[PDB]
Structures are given as C-alpha cells and as structure tokens.
Amino acid sequence: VFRADFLSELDAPAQAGTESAVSGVEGLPPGLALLVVKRGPNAGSRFLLDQAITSAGRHPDSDIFLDDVTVSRRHAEFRLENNEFNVVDVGSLNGTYVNREPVDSAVLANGDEVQIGKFRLVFLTGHKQGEDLEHHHHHH
C-alpha cells in the first residue's frame, strides 16, 4: 500500500526490462540496509531503511512499526553518516545495546546482530560477494 493503483503498471506494455518491484532484496545497489527478525513472534518480518534517520517504536512516519508493550516510542533510532548506517540509544542508562554491550552509539556493518526489547533483528547489507579479502594473519 506504499503506492495507490494510479497510472501504476501503465496499461499493459510488453518490453521494458524491469528489475526491482516486489523483491528489491536482490542486490539493492542504492545505499540501503534491511533488518530481518532472527527470532520472535513475527519471524520472517523485514524492514527497509531508506537511508536518512529511521526511528523505532513510533507509529506515525516510520519504517519500523513494533506494536507491543516493550519498545517505547523511540526505544532506538538509526542515523546515516559517511554512507554508513548507525544505531543511537535515547533510552536512559540501560536500553538498546549491540553484541550484548551497552554503548552510547555504534556503527552497523554487514553480518551484525541487533537486539531491541524482546524482539531480535539482524543488520545485513547487500554485499557484492566480490573479493573475500578482509583481515586474517596466516603466518607465524
């Protein structure tokens, strides 16, 4: 329901060479990141972050919509910087944490795990699966 059936799909064109539509999780070339509920009542749920700042717990304009007793209005918030997604904690003392560690803020990265309230989500990005070179010492 993110787009009313207006001038959508034009009329019935044959050729067009379309790509994304109902599944942009393909390679999402644009600076986009998705969160998947690793475990919880609504398993399989996915959230699309359109860059910028995305609040959590808020019902109004917000990609994340967690309607439950836990997760306050802004239990957690995400901010984009240097083309890199980040997580910021507005919770007093205890609150959102990363890798089971309470910190003021942390930088998200592919293969990272994020836990909010009683729901568990994993932060993943569209990797190019190109060179697997990163950091490893196979000497001495």
Experimental method: NMR
Adjacent-strand bridge partners of 45? none
**Within its chain, how far is the Cα of 44 from the centroid?**
13
Angle 103-115-80 from CA coordinates, rounded to 5°:
65
Structural domain including 96 reads 1-140
Residue 101 in tokens? 């560690």
Q: What single-letter DSSP state applies at residue 82?
A: T
Number of domains in the chain: 1
- Under a CB-based contact definition with an 8 Å cutoff, are residues 104 and 90 in contact? no
CA distances for 22 relative to 18, 32, 42, 99, 110, angstroms? 11, 16, 20, 32, 23
Q: What is the CATH number of the domain that holds 66?
A: 2.60.200.20
Q: What distance in Å separates the CA atoms of residue 106 and residue 58, rounded to the nearest whole number? A: 21
Q: What distance in Å separates the CA atoms of residue 91 and residue 80, rounded to the nearest whole number? A: 19
